[PDB]
Amino acid sequence: GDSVSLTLRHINVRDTAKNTLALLEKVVKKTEAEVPGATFKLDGVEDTVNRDVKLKAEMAAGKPPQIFNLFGGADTQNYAKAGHLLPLNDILKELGLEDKFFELREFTVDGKIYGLPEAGFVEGFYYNTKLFADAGITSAPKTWDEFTKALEALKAKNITPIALGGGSGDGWAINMLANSLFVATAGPEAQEGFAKGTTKWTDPAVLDGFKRLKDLKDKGYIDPNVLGLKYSEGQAKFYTGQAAMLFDGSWATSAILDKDKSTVKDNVGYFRFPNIGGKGDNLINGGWSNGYGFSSHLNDAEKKAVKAFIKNFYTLEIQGEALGRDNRVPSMKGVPTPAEAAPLTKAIGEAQASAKAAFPAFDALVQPKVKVTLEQSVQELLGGQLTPEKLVEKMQKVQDEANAGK
Ligand SMILES: CC(=O)N[C@@H]1[C@@H](O)[C@H](O[C@@H]2O[C@H](CO)[C@@H](O)[C@H](O)[C@H]2NC(C)=O)[C@@H](CO)O[C@H]1O
């Protein structure tokens, strides 16, 4: 016929995501108004739970939601090759969207597009300029030695230097910082070779990154309470003024600028991960990695509703509102930058544009079992439960096991 009901899986569940959810609901309402009979049932799920358990299990059963928050790289590759992702090339051409995205490479398998980035990301250090000034730092550190000097000065003032919430199942929050440490010590191509068999987690330059990560914790630069706080609590420690910096993705800018929760809005700056002097200088972790994918097991009315949702979500107006009102870097070209953008906003753009290149997050490049093994391992590493050497050996074992199976 007919009238259809589609499940829309999203991860915009936290109070710091109210903006993003409201924009999604606004898009949904517009789609329902122009497609009679089409109804969307929003299913909000925690980020780790959707990506690593719920959607993973649904896809193993071959029964994903019709619409779901999806990650580029390994996740998209697995579900595309299992045949559970709608190919989007023809929809994009029909909607005149074929040429409008900055980068679809993470969502592309054998030339076919299997999901659409909602936004871009970078990762970097948010920092409190007043807490820095209290400790004698007057500039954001550009180099690693400038960075450790800042950490020393902060610790000497009994200021918690680096907030980080890596407890419970939020090991990925530690991996954001690890992520960029081992690209800085080993270079961006090192993480590309793990899945290829051409580099190893045990390579000395990679191990060096994890040595430095542990040392940040041992010296008290990473919050001693890192394993006692969930991701969002680590975030809150920074934006309530209780620690001097925070390594996080640009989706976090909203939380940090939130009027009701942030005490630091007049005193926040940003700097890229500092230069160590190897193959990763002046690079930035970033890309277009996260957005919506669609089930391939659709009847014609489902396909019509899915096309209309894509039409109404991936539009310059919706992208510009996410940028101006939720600080989410556009995934589409041609989005004008809003008026009176906060200093923080100006700093993150300068950080992105002046980078010589971006490198993706490692979880775009390695299988899910490898990712979750690292998550568990860095929590151990920061808890006195694992040495840097034992971590890299553990990682290369699961890497070999993943490469052999695939
Ligand atoms: C469009 C957007 O900004 N989505 C955000 C997600 O990217 C982000 O998830 C994290 O993204 C990183 C970069 O792709 C991944 O390395 C990281 O593994 C991933 N974290 C998880 C738990 O999946 C989430 C974080 O809550 O926020 C989204 O809004």
Numbering used by the authors: 46 to 451
Q: Which passages does the manuscript contain on this structure?
A:
There were two polypeptide chains in the asymmetric unit of the crystal of the ligand-free form (chain A, Asp47–Leu452 and chain B, Val49–Gly450), whereas there was only one polypeptide chain in the ligand-bound form. In both (GlcNAc)2 bound structures of NagB1 and NagB2, the first GlcNAc interacted with the tryptophan residue Trp213 of NagB1 or Trp217 of NagB2 and formed hydrogen-bonding networks with surrounding residues. The O3, O4, O6, and O7 atoms of the first GlcNAc formed hydrogen bonds with Arg95, Asp401, and Ser330 of NagB1 and Arg96, Asp408, and Ser334 of NagB2. The second GlcNAc unit formed a CH/π interaction with Trp292 of NagB1 or Trp296 of NagB2.
In conclusion, we identified and characterized Paenibacillus spp. NagB1 and NagB2 proteins as SBPs for chitin oligosaccharides.
